[PDB]
Amino acid sequence: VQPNMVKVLADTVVRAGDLDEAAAQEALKAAEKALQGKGAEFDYSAAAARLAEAAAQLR
Amino acid sequence: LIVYDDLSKQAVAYRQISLLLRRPPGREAYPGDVFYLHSRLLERASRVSEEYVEKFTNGAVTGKTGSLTALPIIETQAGDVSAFVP
Amino acid sequence: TNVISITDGQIFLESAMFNSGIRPAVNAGISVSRVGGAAQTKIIKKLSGGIRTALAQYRELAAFAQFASDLDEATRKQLEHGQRVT
Amino acid sequence: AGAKEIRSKIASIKSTQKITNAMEKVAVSKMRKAQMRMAAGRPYAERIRQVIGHLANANPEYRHPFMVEYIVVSSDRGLCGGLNINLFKSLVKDMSGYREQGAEIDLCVIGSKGASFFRSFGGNVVAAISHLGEEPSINDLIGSVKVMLDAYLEGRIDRLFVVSNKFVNTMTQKPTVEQLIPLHHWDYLYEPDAKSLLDGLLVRYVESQVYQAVVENNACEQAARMIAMKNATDNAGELISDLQLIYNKARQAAITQEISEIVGGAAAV
Amino acid sequence: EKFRDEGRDVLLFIDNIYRYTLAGTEVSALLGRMPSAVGYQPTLAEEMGVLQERITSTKKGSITSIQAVYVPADDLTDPSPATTFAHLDATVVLSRDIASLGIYPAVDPLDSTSRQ
Amino acid sequence: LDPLVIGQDHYDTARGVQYVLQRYKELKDIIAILGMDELSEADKLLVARARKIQRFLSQPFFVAEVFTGSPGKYVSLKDTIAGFKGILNGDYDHLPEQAFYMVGGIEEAVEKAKK
């Protein structure tokens, strides 16, 4: 509230420490990656050029 | 009003006679005058003027126009309208 | 197909290239001369070899050129040279 | 073989061309539904930004950890006109800056095609959600957003961003990266303590920005799907035209062959 | 040809050039000649050339011709259209869509063409 | 082309090449309408190997030197089987598709990919 304005910013679900933590823990469990890897991924250009050409050749 | 229930069957009967008379065949084995067969028939269906009726009837009928309307029927094969008789 | 089995190469003229403003519409992709490689003069033989490859590099990129300005410098220079040779 | 097989191929492609022409408009219809949902969520995000700005300026007593020094959005379905590819191509450009800087990277994934991408190159997934409807709900994003917020409070992440497409126009989807966590005459009458208020509002702010990125990416997806089905309709038309030329050749050959067998038979009798 | 010889420029309208080709096919079959490709008369190109080569511009005057053309089975490669297009100098295409907008004449400025 | 005449290694390599090229030929109409990106993860890998096999089958001849300029190549049966077996096994999945075009033996595809 301000002298000439009243703003109500509601919430879509009932927040709480359990529900808020549970959704995060369920997202760790959902990150089901048998082999984690490294993230270096040097094949970026080799894949990006192939798909760039395939997406262009379609038009 | 005249209905020819199958002009395609008339063409088949004329093709039979022509091949048995040994006349030269064309496309689909029809004779060279199969177009003239149907055209000579269908150009008779017409509307004639009052002067034609007055001349034909020797003045017995006056101020009237006569007519013959035709509804020929043809059978296509799997919708192919490009066949020779159709 | 019979005349191609007799002659020593063919110049193909393409309708799409002619309607696109390229009036001497020779289709380099399929036009060939079997005995003519031994017939060229020394100056045209040495300068032409670098030009046929440029048109081969252009043939694959020509249609997509309007949105090909953001690719690597090699692809962009091959396309830019291909447009100039064309 | 002949004219019959060609006629069957033409009919098959003709049936497919009619639906790709119709689905282009279905995608435009869904694009407009997504565009109205993008506008409906703006008043909430801008007011939360206005409150946090004053509530931080006016109260120099406390600095939230989010005021001092990737979540990837992707589709769950086919027919995307390079939408996901242009986004993954761009992610590498900002990650290259992190590789020159020597910084470590944590990733969060929204959508099935994004999960399939990192799984095919060995990418480290810290959180992941998929199979969301074309009109998503913000309560499904809370989980994936919280894991990424916790990693910041635990000191594991220095900066966090949302990777998604932006709606430049109905014919253009732009791949982007936006920073999430690191962001005068009166004062407010705080009923609870101001820390509790600022801590609660900052969580709602980041969740709202992630939801807006997801809804704008869905508008970009329907726009990309329109172009893809337009192109499929046009490509099928070229194939039908070429098959019609092959069919005409078979029509002329069949008439010529039948007459050549008929004339030979009448010459013998 | 008589009007051309008076020193005039003349217009010759042919109701349908495809029916001229078909009448030649019918006569050729009646005379018993051996048929050619797609069943047309063996004299197809010569019968078209004998008619079309008289329509020209001469030192005395000229004959210009407007000929309505029918394309069998919509196939532009068929012997009748293919033999006729070798003699044509211009193509005027009339569009049902242009006539619907109230424009007359209904010529399609994009499909119609000329060698001139 | 019989196991009792050429041995099982040659016979299985030849049969493997034909299976990949046949499956690629079945996808031609779908790829033309919807593009390569709509195929399954299995079909995408097979199409990529089919394109490499199709290019590795090419070879510069000693009688064709006048047409282009490139020197001719003679490839032994041993080198032929080794190259196609490696492409079928996936030993060359990382090399670019243009490295297999006009190179004689399989080792030359590895050197061409360096450019």
Q: Minimal CA–CA distance to C30: which of C48, C3, C11?
A: C11
Residue D214 CB neighbour total at 10 angstroms: 21
Cα distance from E52 to chain B (closest Cα, Å)?
A: 25
Joined tokens for residue D122 = 């060995």
Q: Would you name the residues of C annotated as active-site residues?
A: 34
Cα distance from B47 to chain D (closest Cα, Å)?
A: 39
F33 and D79 within 8 Å at the Cβ level: the answer is: no
Stated as kind and residue range, the H or E segment containing D107 is strand D107-110
Interatomic CA distance for residues D163 and D153, integer angstroms: 21
C64 and A52 within 8 Å at the Cβ level: the answer is: no
Joined tokens for residue D238 = 């070229």
F69 and C38 within 8 Å at the Cβ level: the answer is: no
> Tokens 């006729």 — which residue?
E84
Interatomic CA distance for residues E29 and E24, integer angstroms: 9
Q: Classify strands B47-48 and B66-67 as parallel, antiparallel or unpaired.
A: antiparallel
C37 and F69 within 8 Å at the Cβ level: the answer is: no
Q: Please check whether residue D165 is in contact with residue D175, taking contact to mean a CB–CB distance below 8 angstroms.
A: yes
Nearest Cβ partner for B33 among E22, E30, E32: E30
Chains B and A touch (3+ CB pairs under 8 A): no
D259 and B27 within 8 Å at the Cβ level: the answer is: yes
D80 and F38 within 8 Å at the Cβ level: the answer is: no
List, in order, residues 6 or more apart from B29 with CB less than 8 Å away: B15, B19, D262
For F69, list phi and psi in degrees, rounded to 5. Answer: 130, -30
Interatomic CA distance for residues F25 and D16, integer angstroms: 20
Neighbours of chain E (3+ CB pairs under 8 A): B, D
Whether the CB of D88 is below 8 Å from some CB of chain A: the reply is yes
The CA-based angle A31-A37-A38, given to 5 degrees, is 115
> Tokens 């761009």 — which residue?
D90
Q: Please check whether residue D143 is in contact with residue D129, taking contact to mean a CB–CB distance below 8 angstroms.
A: yes
Nearest Cβ partner for A31 among D81, D127, D186: D127
Chains A and C touch (3+ CB pairs under 8 A): yes
Whether the CB of F36 is below 8 Å from some CB of chain A: the reply is yes
Interatomic CA distance for residues D193 and D200, integer angstroms: 11
> Tokens 């079309």 — which residue?
E52
3-state secondary structure chain E: CHHHHCCCEEEEEECCHHHHHHHHHHHHHHCCCCCCHHHCCCCHHHHHHHHHCCCCECCCCEEEEEECCCCHHHCCCCHHHHHHHCCCCEECCECHHHHHCCCCCCECCCCCEECC
Crossing angle of the two packed helices F41-56 and F77-89, in degrees rounded to 10: 160
Nearest Cβ partner for D259 among E35, E73, E75: E35
Q: Minimal CA–CA distance to D64: which of D53, D48, D78?
A: D53
Pick left, alpha or beta for residue D13 (phi over 0 → left; psi -120 to 50 → alpha; otherwise beta). Answer: alpha
Own/partner long-range contacts of B10-16 (Cβ < 8 Å, ≥24 apart): B10/B37, B10/B38, B11/B37, B11/B38, B11/B85
Q: Best of D241, D242, D256, D261 to disrupt the E interface by mutation (most E CBs within 10 Å)?
A: D256
List, in order, residues 6 or more apart from E114 with CB less than 8 Å away: E89, E90, E91
Interatomic CA distance for residues F28 and F50, integer angstroms: 12
Whether the CB of D236 is below 8 Å from some CB of chain F: the reply is yes
Interatomic CA distance for residues A15 and D200, integer angstroms: 10
B22 DSSP 8-state letter: T
List, in order, residues 6 or more apart from E21 with CB less than 8 Å away: E40, E44, E47, E48, E80, E83, E84
- Give the chain B residue nearest D261 (alpha carbons): B29
3-state secondary structure D49-76: HHHHHHHHHCCCCCCCHHHCCCEEECCC
Cα distance from A56 to chain C (closest Cα, Å)?
A: 7
Q: Please check whether residue B32 is in contact with residue B24, taking contact to mean a CB–CB distance below 8 angstroms.
A: yes
Interatomic CA distance for residues D92 and D96, integer angstroms: 6
Torsion of CA D9, D15, D21, D27, to 10 degrees: -110
Interatomic CA distance for residues D149 and A59, integer angstroms: 41
Joined tokens for residue D97 = 């800056």
Torsion of CA E31, E32, E37, E42, to 10 degrees: -50
Helix (H, G, I), strand (E, B) or coil at D108: strand
Q: Please check whether residue D167 is in contact with residue D220, taking contact to mean a CB–CB distance below 8 angstroms.
A: yes
Q: Minimal CA–CA distance to D223: which of D35, D70, D22?
A: D35
Neighbours of chain C (3+ CB pairs under 8 A): A, F
Helix (H, G, I), strand (E, B) or coil at D137: coil
Interatomic CA distance for residues D204 and A15, integer angstroms: 11
Q: Please check whether residue D198 is in contact with residue D52, taking contact to mean a CB–CB distance below 8 angstroms.
A: yes
E39 and D256 within 8 Å at the Cβ level: the answer is: yes
B76 DSSP 8-state letter: -
Q: Classify strands E90-91 and E113-114 as parallel, antiparallel or unpaired.
A: antiparallel
The CA-based angle E90-E91-E97, given to 5 degrees, is 150
List, in order, residues 6 or more apart from F33 with CB less than 8 Å away: D13, D16, D232, D235, D236, D239
F67 and C37 within 8 Å at the Cβ level: the answer is: yes
Chain C environment of A52 (Cβ under 8 Å): 71
For B23, list phi and psi in degrees, rounded to 5. Answer: -75, 145
3-state secondary structure F74-85: CCCHHHHHHHHH
- Residue length of chain C: 86
What is the DSSP annotation of D156-199? S-S--EEEEEEEEETTEEEEEEEE-S---------SS-HHHHHH
Whether the CB of A52 is below 8 Å from some CB of chain D: the reply is yes
Cα distance from D23 to chain B (closest Cα, Å)?
A: 30
Cα distance from F115 to chain C (closest Cα, Å)?
A: 12
- Resolution in Å, one decimal, please: 3.2
D236 and F29 within 8 Å at the Cβ level: the answer is: no
Interatomic CA distance for residues D159 and D96, integer angstroms: 15
- Give the chain D residue nearest E75 (alpha carbons): D248
Whether the CB of C38 is below 8 Å from some CB of chain F: the reply is yes
Q: Please check whether residue E61 is in contact with residue E9, taking contact to mean a CB–CB distance below 8 angstroms.
A: yes
Nearest Cβ partner for A55 among D82, D105, D186: D82
Neighbours of chain B (3+ CB pairs under 8 A): D, E
- Give the chain F residue nearest C34 (alpha carbons): F67
Neighbours of chain A (3+ CB pairs under 8 A): C, D, F
D139 and A12 within 8 Å at the Cβ level: the answer is: yes
Chain F environment of D13 (Cβ under 8 Å): 33
> Tokens 């086919």 — which residue?
D78
C71 and A52 within 8 Å at the Cβ level: the answer is: yes
Interatomic CA distance for residues F29 and E15, integer angstroms: 45
D259 and E39 within 8 Å at the Cβ level: the answer is: yes
Q: Minimal CA–CA distance to D52: which of D154, D156, D200?
A: D200
Measure Cα distances from D259 to D64, D150, D248, E6, E38 in Å: 93, 84, 17, 48, 8
Measure Cα distances from D16 to A48, D28, D186 in Å: 30, 19, 65
Interatomic CA distance for residues A5 and F48, integer angstroms: 62
Whether the CB of E49 is below 8 Å from some CB of chain B: the reply is no
Whether the CB of D124 is below 8 Å from some CB of chain A: the reply is yes
Q: Best of B27, B77, B80, B81 to disrupt the D interface by mutation (most D CBs within 10 Å)?
A: B27
Cα E7 to its chain centre, rounded Å, is 25
Whether the CB of A18 is below 8 Å from some CB of chain D: the reply is no
- Give the chain C residue nearest A59 (alpha carbons): C64
Interatomic CA distance for residues D65 and D199, integer angstroms: 10
Residue A56 CB neighbour total at 10 angstroms: 17
